[PDB]
Amino acid sequence: DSVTQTEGQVALSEEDFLTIHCNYSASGYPALFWYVQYPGEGPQFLFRASRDKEKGSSRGFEATYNKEATSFHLQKASVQESDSAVYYCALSGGNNKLTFGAGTKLTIKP
Amino acid sequence: DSVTQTEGQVALSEEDFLTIHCNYSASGYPALFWYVQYPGEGPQFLFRASRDKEKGSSRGFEATYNKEATSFHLQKASVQESDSAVYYCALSGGNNKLTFGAGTKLTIKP
């Protein structure tokens, strides 16, 4: 199983629209996640989508489980300073362990 | 539910013995884990331990589930240069969600 997301960095300004890409490959019917990792901490659970077409969301963030395109893109209509962090796209299936992507460094500026 | 590990960086030289502490606190019987995040990559599953006294291992690393002291200390008898990475201690209660420690930077020397 594998996760591939927008690598590197994405630098936005406050009030901007955020879109982070994530496509995956897993057999079965995996759960899909989004975790946040603020500076000086470990990854923390953002939201989960368990079914195809289910849209997870938390803190203004959301992602729709799309199985035809095998993707789980993250969006936020208006990003703000305190969102500066690294976002990882993840999946749980296969055999009970979490598969993480490389993470995208989202840097917001005022 | 919380996980707390060896704050920061731990520097060593090849073949040394390592121990990165992890002390958890959660209700019920949680599954404990350690993940490794190699440079340029996302966090990855290292091993898990579901019940007291159980001992996980992979790549010469091992942690003993200690229900009484509520600890899950990572140990490797002889550390190697390829081992330089950040190690997280995780916890999963009733399936699904994983709670992460902040991580510890392990820096080996040749």
Side-chain angles (χ1 to χ4, degrees):
Chain A
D1 287 5
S2 44
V3 169
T4 299
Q5 51 181 117
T6 292
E7 54 172 14
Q9 187 181 272
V10 181
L12 286 2
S13 319
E14 308 204 67
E15 319 293 43
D16 279 24
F17 191 105
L18 169 71
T19 296
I20 279 175
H21 305 85
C22 175
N23 272 78
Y24 66 94
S25 175
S27 204
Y29 201 171
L32 295 172
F33 303 76
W34 263 106
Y35 276 60
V36 206
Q37 181 173 209
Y38 303 104
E41 324 180 305
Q44 80 180 256
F45 186 84
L46 192 57
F47 57 80
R48 175 197 205 227
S50 48
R51 290 137 107 119
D52 182 36
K53 288 179 189 68
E54 174 181 324
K55 164 217 249 183
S57 51
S58 195
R59 310 178 229 212
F61 286 87
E62 67 209 24
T64 314
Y65 192 130
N66 188 333
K67 207 276 170 162
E68 272 127 82
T70 70
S71 71
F72 195 54
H73 317 321
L74 180 84
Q75 290 185 306
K76 203 176 170 189
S78 49
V79 80
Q80 80 115 297
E81 186 68 320
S82 60
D83 286 325
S84 299
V86 167
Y87 295 72
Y88 296 94
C89 178
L91 141 178
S92 170
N95 62 270
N96 195 223
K97 43 182 177 46
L98 221 48
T99 295
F100 288 82
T104 308
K105 217 285 196 86
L106 189 259
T107 181
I108 310 299
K109 86 170 182 77
Chain B
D1 297 12
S2 235
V3 152
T4 326
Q5 59 184 101
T6 299
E7 183 179 348
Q9 187 182 285
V10 179
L12 267 33
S13 311
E14 286 193 294
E15 305 190 275
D16 276 20
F17 164 68
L18 164 79
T19 289
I20 289 174
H21 296 86
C22 180
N23 252 90
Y24 74 94
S25 59
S27 345
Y29 216 12
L32 292 147
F33 311 76
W34 272 97
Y35 275 63
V36 209
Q37 178 155 203
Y38 298 107
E41 299 163 54
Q44 74 182 267
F45 179 85
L46 197 48
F47 60 65
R48 169 185 174 246
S50 46
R51 70 274 154 153
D52 188 21
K53 287 175 183 56
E54 202 191 312
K55 185 197 167 203
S57 41
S58 181
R59 307 204 250 305
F61 285 99
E62 42 188 80
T64 298
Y65 198 133
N66 191 322
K67 217 285 167 182
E68 305 296 309
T70 48
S71 71
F72 193 57
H73 307 148
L74 183 71
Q75 296 195 327
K76 193 171 191 165
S78 46
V79 120
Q80 203 217 315
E81 267 264 66
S82 56
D83 291 323
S84 316
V86 173
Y87 297 79
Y88 300 98
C89 191
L91 179 169
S92 166
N95 291 254
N96 294 14
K97 198 176 190 162
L98 256 64
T99 301
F100 281 89
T104 308
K105 218 300 191 60
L106 212 212
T107 299
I108 318 306
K109 242 51 125 56

